[PDB]
Write a protein that binds this ligand. Structure first.
Ligand SMILES: Nc1ncnc2c1ncn2[C@@H]1O[C@H](COP(=O)(O)OP(=O)(O)O)[C@@H](O)[C@H]1O
Lengths: 310, 314
């Protein structure tokens, strides 16, 4: 009874809230938040906050790999990373006057031995857990079919997969025969996959998620950010209506949403409860300055204002 | 060998991350492939230049955490000897975004040094003093240190007859200047020189002479004032020098202060005469400004620049 989170390209994420960003000048900051991040470790930390059994895996290397291990050790978060010869990356987010300016490093190249070695390691971890949450970019050096390989292994074992990626990486999965249990493209990402103009009408959205691309995927949950979410569970369509709140920092909120989904999947919660938990954790995060952080003293209050109807 | 060696001090080093972007897209995601992460801090630039010119050098200061380990690893790879005092706090990052001709920097305040660490480094420093003949001190004090910390360090050097080359600015500099234990060399540039005095920038020889001889700068053997492209103006004891310099093509002048410090410290260590010291200092500053890298020097061009510089007693 446990969740496996997979972060093949984890990151030491650094957040810089500035009063104003001065280009071509010096910007001074005091205390700064440096977290075990990349999408998958944001998921991990939120699942740990809620209290569910979670084990983090993926690739780490170098001094920044030790920094991530350390941050997890301090919160009592279990991990079984595969150690690589390369170096774990940084990513930066500059928060300034309403703007959110991010710089994402490519990350380390994984070699043939590490890539094959990790698959074997993953097979052992799969034995254990009852759900896998896969987040983010495939790191450089892995073959394009790497996630399809992982999901095939999950399917062979009957372990549901929540898949949080986008663009080419998700496209590759959707075209392969081994399907994740849940996918989560926002409206912008959804129509990008279709090579089609973005349209927020209801009939255009049902048409969008029923398109051949998403065949055999049980849950398709479409992030509409502050406007809420639109979701399909098998043949049933939902509109998730959410309240207005005061957003401090929205980064990592898609990941907080993944934490909620995966928690509901593990515990076999009903359609309404899954969708509410998901959007609730996504909201809590956007209200915290820290990314991948949730104030559970406010969970009940928000959850109660969410309406799931379409 | 078993004391002919320079000690550099970097009390607040950084792991500097450099992001060269095509453009920086604000309020959007920017992907970078070629990130460069280096062991940074003014004192480490000094150390690196000294290593290039081939002077015996040891680096010290404070380091901590995984980022402190990164710094030591970088210096090990470069074969630069170091004896940092280890702290519990974590060494900071600094960010440089290079985009569309711009250099946008984010500078972290960094760790706080506790009382035990502050006292520990001082004891450590007293031991290092036994095997060096010059100390180059660069940069501001980290958080948590008494404002008197550089004066404490300079007192220890004075007690051993070890000359100090001091490269800091503003209130950090002024605190040293107001204390009785003096550095051997300071190098405020012409704008800093008059701000320190609370005067307007008067670039006349008579004003320079007067400014440099104010009681704020009493007891300091060498005051070397950079005038940017025009060269330098200096006082040694009671003698004044003008250093005139060739016009050259500038790539990147960042780190040129650090290079001239390396030059000054090398010259002090070797007891070079006044002309040779000022020419070495300014040449290294010039060689760095010719380079895209920061704190980097092409010694193949050294002889050619050096021979052009004129030093005039004025
Ligand atoms: N500004 C906001 N106001 C209210 N809720 C938000 C806001 N931003 C995110 N959320 C919550 O988080 C969920 C995921 O948001 P999303 O924009 O996909 O995350 P990200 O910003 O990481 O892409 C949303 O469904 C919503 O419930």
């Amino acid at each position: 009874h446990m969740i496996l989170t997979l972060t093949l390209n984890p990151s030491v994420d650094i957040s810089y809230p500035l009063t104003a960003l001065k280009l071509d000048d010096v910007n001074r900051v005091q205390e700064v938040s440096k977290t075990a991040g990349g999408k998958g470790l944001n998921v991990t930390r939120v699942l740990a906050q809620v209290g569910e059994p979670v084990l983090a895996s993926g690739f780490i290397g170098g001094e920044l790999g030790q920094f991530i291990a350390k941050k997890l050790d301090h919160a009592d978060i279990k991990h079984a990373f595969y150690n690589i010869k390369g170096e774990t990356r940084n990513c930066i987010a500059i928060l300034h006057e309403g703007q959110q300016t991010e710089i994402l490093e490519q990350g380390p190249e994984i070699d043939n031995q590490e890539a094959a070695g990790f698959i074997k390691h993953f097979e052992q971890l799969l034995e254990k857990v009852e759900a896998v949450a896969i987040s983010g970019s495939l790191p450089k050096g892995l073959n394009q079919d790497y996630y399809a390989q992982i999901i095939e292994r999950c399917q062979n074992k009957g372990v549901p997969v929540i898949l949080d990626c986008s663009g080419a990486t998700l496209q590759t999965v959707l075209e392969n025969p081994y399907k994740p249990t849940v996918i989560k493209p926002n409206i912008s990402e959804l129509y990008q996959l279709l090579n089609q103009p973005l349209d927020e009408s209801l009939e255009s959205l049902k048409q969008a998620v029923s398109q051949p691309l998403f065949e055999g995927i049980e849950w398709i949950i479409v992030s509409l950010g502050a406007q809420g979410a639109f979701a399909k569970h098998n043949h049933t369509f939902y509109r998730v209506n959410i309240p207005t709140i005061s957003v401090l920092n929205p980064v990592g909120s898609g990941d907080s949403t993944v934490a909620g989904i995966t928690s509901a999947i593990l515990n076999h919660e009903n359609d309404h409860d899954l969708l509410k938990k998901a959007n609730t954790l996504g909201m809590l995060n956007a209200q915290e300055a820290q990314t991948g952080y949730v104030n559970l003293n406010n969970y009940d209050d928000l959850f109660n204002q969410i309406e799931v109807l379409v």
